[PDB]
Design a protein around this ligand. Structure first.
Ligand code: ATP
Ligand code: ATP
Ligand code: A1BD5
Ligand code: CA
Ligand code: ZN
Ligand code: ZN
Lengths: 694, 146, 49, 48
């Protein structure tokens, strides 16, 4: 593996048909027999593992212990036909035959897979790199054919990305992808967050800003993966372990709890449909359920209790699941503003931003960099902006003692923590806790869950308050959420046009009050008349209430003006009212809402179309790649996969800096400098090397 | 064929065969396919309309019961919101169909202590249900066709 | 796919479609790594026929 | 149509330089290329 790493290092910064790569191919050709022997070793052992996994082999073996005779083992593989006779003999030699000549295929298979994984992966990487950099050579293709099974086995782990290389030339980078990393990426909530992020950037992000947003999303996804790993599960102490198990179970089942709460609200409301009111008990009216069985009243009581309990459990699960992500994002953005921009040092917003003002409390606190990974951001901020405000000013701003960092740098001291409730009591930092509670209470999802719980308690007070929980299914479904968001998408225009409608109706009311008072009587009886325009407020309310709702306008409601001296002015008044208010303004308000709905749906479709048409990383359209069949599909799947970019970032984080290669170190330095020039921008490996490839 | 045999049983069952000309013509086939082109959205928005009408029914049942009498005769009254199921059916049946909303059907609240809340209730019903949600369902069908 | 399982055993499966030798081609393709007899019983062929 | 005219005017300003008429895409090859071109190289405020 070390030798192959040296060869790969020789291949760093190599162009297509490079002289280094050609010498490597010639050297492989000179040692072709030994290379084939190595590849045969790897492929035979991989095939042996798949065969001990194979049903035909399991049928061949008849021992209850699973031990197979050398003769039976031989006939089993020759039944599989993947191995030739000398290969079978060599496998028999490799297997440690006991005195009965019995063979344990499980240990015979897993004995060599673990040691050979690293070297096999490196060999696959080297062969892939050589094949892509020297595409025309037939000897390389032969070597690839022999290593076909190894390449197939390591394909899901082999990650490739292209970076904007150091030499101002596009380079392709090969790296390992962990099985755990891929498994966490395949998680449905991670996929949902990825979809949300993609929609947000493609809708309202510029290309230059989009790399920074993408890197921030990668960091948030890494933290979310850590949260998921922690919450996943394979006398103060026993109480504590039970409590953490309970919290983890709540966090894992948070969406299930939400759905159960929705179902409980539906059942409660269905029960409520049977409610009826009668003056007689089951001059004050009595509310009681009307059912023959009589089970429904206790059923409703238990259902309400269980619904409130489930709402409380949902709040706890949300605190254990999403609040860490919220705090992580806020701490990360605060740290970056503190260090790269010197926000509270240089900028010093004088109540410019409410979030910025709130963030002032946490800077002094010792526990500020807790949730976010960098615990040295305070020290970095000090080293950056100390000189031109002074060490002591930055120290008092960030709540550091200056001698503490020096003594920690000089040596490490470990204090023992007492396992006491009080010892945990002054362990708390009230300023950080207050800032965290403010951040949580400013969160829309937490506020929604709190309103849900409050409405559940109010439902315990009066059962009909449980009807408000039926609104949750609206925000649960994307179409209904878009419907709700449509009314606020054009909210300013809606408010202004409603105001204009009110103004025009007020003018019509003024005209009616001055002249057309007689027609506004709404009482048929001569003895008792009721007048709408005898009072200006009454007539204004009458107009806004009945005229706007009426299809023909106010003239439908008020009395016919036939045979009156004001008849022509009155018909003009009615017709103009019906034209301006019923037709134009109501149509405009309806149009605002409906066009908001349609515009949001078109935004969804446009985001999907843009993803299908352009590569998200390099920005080149699908048409250029599509000249080669499935060209865009391959480009997005292997060459420029954003999942591969995230995997590369995680791999860089886990890997040791001393172990970083040249390209890895270069990308790591750009990443810590927050410079995104390494991302390919309008350029591709196949675009840069198109002539040499062709 | 089954409908033809049922038409032999009763002649009016032959009326169902008139639907065949619809699927025969491309324009009518597109009209039929439009209602299913956005079927999931249609079902969800109809459910949301039912939910909002149910909330309005709950409010009316709790407070505005008196206005819901639909009998002019003093001796024999009939009540829609005396029972929650009855008032829900009354809403979904008459309020949605009415152009002005439920307030057109129910009795005028003039000179009542609940008059302002009731006019707010009627106006919001007419805005949310008659205008927005019905317009959205119509839009789903028509935009599917187009 | 579940419904199509019944027709594989039947002798008349390739009737309507033109290739009457698709069973034999499937056997020659995937016999070795399941065995001749397994593909034969799957497609309802006698091997000697 | 009037509202679409407003949006189209805004979009045209975002897409093309007001002085030279070259689209944003040519400048955008260099990062923030159009922003720099409109801010220093071809600022109509600078022309005034
Ligand atoms: N750089 C990129 N990396 C990955 N995917 C990209 C990139 N640029 C564009 N895409 C598009 O992103 C899409 C995401 O694929 P995915 O399968 O996860 O999506 P989906 O919403 O499940 O639908 P579908 O399977 O129809 O694409 C791909 O279809 C691809 O065309
Ligand atoms: N030659 C040009 N000179 C200046 N601005 C130009 C030119 N060509 C196009 N523009 C565009 O004019 C816009 C005017 O910028 P300004 O900040 O004044 O506008 P705004 O209406 O406040 O909105 P915004 O800040 O979102 O651009 C710029 O965003 C720029 O893209
Ligand atoms: O929390 C972690 O595992 C973690 C540790 N260190 C990190 N370093 C870095 O530069 N970026 C990260 O995203 C990161 C994450
Ligand atoms: Ca090194
Ligand atoms: Zn690309
Ligand atoms: Zn210009």
């Amino acid at each position: 593996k070390d030798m192959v790493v040296m060869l790969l290092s020789l291949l760093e910064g190599n162009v297509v048909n490079g002289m280094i790569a050609r010498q490597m191919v010639d050297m492989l050709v000179e040692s072709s027999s030994n290379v084939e022997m190595i590849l045969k070793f790897f492929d035979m052992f991989l095939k042996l593992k798949d065969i001990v996994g194979s049903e035909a082999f399991q049928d061949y073996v008849t021992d209850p212990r699973g031990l197979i005779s050398k003769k039976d083992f031989q006939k089993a593989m020759d039944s599989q036909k993947q191995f030739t006779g000398p290969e079978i003999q060599f496998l028999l030699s490799c297997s440690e035959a006991d005195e009965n000549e019995m063979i344990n295929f499980e240990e015979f298979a897993n004995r060599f897979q673990e040691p050979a994984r690293d070297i096999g992966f490196n060999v696959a990487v080297l062969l892939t790199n050589l094949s892509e950099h020297v595409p025309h050579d037939p000897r390389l293709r032969n070597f690839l054919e022999l290593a076909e099974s190894i390449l197939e086995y390591f394909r899901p782990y082999l990650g490739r990305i292209e970076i904007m290389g150091a030499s101002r030339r596009i380079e392709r980078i090969y790296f390992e992808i962990s099985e755990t990393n891929r498994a966490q990426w395949e998680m449905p909530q991670v996929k949902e967050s990825k979809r949300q992020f993609i929609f947000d950037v493609v809708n309202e992000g510029g290309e230059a800003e989009k790399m920074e947003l993408f890197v921030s999303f990668c960091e948030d996804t890494i933290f979310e993966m850590q949260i998921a790993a922690q919450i996943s599960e394979p006398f103060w102490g026993e109480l504590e372990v039970q409590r953490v198990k309970f919290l983890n179970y709540l966090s894992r089942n948070f969406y299930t709890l939400r759905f159960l709460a929705l179902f409980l609200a539906f059942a409660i409301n269905f029960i409520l449909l049977f409610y009826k009111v009668s003056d007689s008990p089951p001059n004050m009216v009595y509310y009681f359920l009307e059912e023959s069985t009589g089970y429904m009243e206790p059923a409703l009581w238990c259902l309400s209790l269980l619904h409130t309990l489930v709402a409380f459990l949902c709040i706890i699960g949300y605190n254990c699941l999403k609040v860490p992500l919220v705090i992580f994002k806020r701490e990360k953005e605060l740290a970056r503003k503190l260090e790269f921009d010197g926000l509270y040092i240089t900028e010093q917003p004088g109540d410019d931003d409410v979030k910025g003002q709130w963030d002032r409390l946490v800077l002094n606190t010792p526990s500020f960099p807790s949730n976010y990974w960098d615990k040295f951001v305070k020290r970095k901020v000090l080293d950056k902006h100390g000189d031109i405000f002074g060490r002591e000013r930055i120290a008092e701003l960030l709540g550091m003692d200056l001698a503490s960092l020096e003594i920690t740098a000089h040596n490490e001291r470990k204090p023992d923590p007492p396992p006491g409730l009080l010892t945990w009591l002054m362990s708390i930092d009230v300023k950080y806790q207050i800032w965290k509670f403010g951040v949580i209470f400013t969160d829309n999802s937490f506020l929604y869950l709190g309103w849900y719980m409050v409405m559940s308690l109010l439902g315990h007070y009066n059962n009909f308050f449980f009807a408000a929980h039926l609104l949750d299914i609206a925000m649960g479904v994307k179409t209904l959420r878009t419907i709700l968001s449509s009314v606020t998408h054009n909210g300013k225009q809606l408010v202004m046009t409603v105001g204009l409608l009110a103004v025009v109706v007020y003018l019509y009311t003024v005209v009616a009050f001055n002249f057309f008072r007689k027609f506004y009587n709404k009482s048929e009886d001569e003895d008792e008349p009721d007048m709408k325009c005898d009072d200006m407020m009454t007539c204004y309310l009458f107009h806004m209430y009945v005229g706007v709702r009426a299809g023909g306008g106010i003239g439908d409601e008020i009395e016919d003006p036939a045979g009156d001296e004001y008849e022509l002015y009155r018909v003009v008044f009615d017709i103009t009212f019906f034209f301006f208010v019923i037709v134009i303004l109501l149509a405009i308000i309806q149009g605002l809402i409906i066009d908001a709905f349609g515009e949001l749906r078109d935004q969804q479709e446009q985001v999907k179309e843009d993803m299908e048409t352009k590569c998200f990383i390099c920005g080149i359209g699908s048409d250029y790649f599509d000249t080669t069949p499935h060209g865009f599909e391959t480009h997005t799947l292997e060459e420029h996969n954003l999942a591969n970019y995230m995997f590369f970032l995680m791999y860089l984080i886990n890997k040791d800096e001393t172990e970083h290669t040249g390209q890895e170190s270069y990308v790591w330095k750009m990443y810590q400098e927050r410079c995104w020039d390494f991302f390919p921008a309008g350029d591709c490996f196949r675009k840069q090397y198109e002539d040499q490839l062709s």
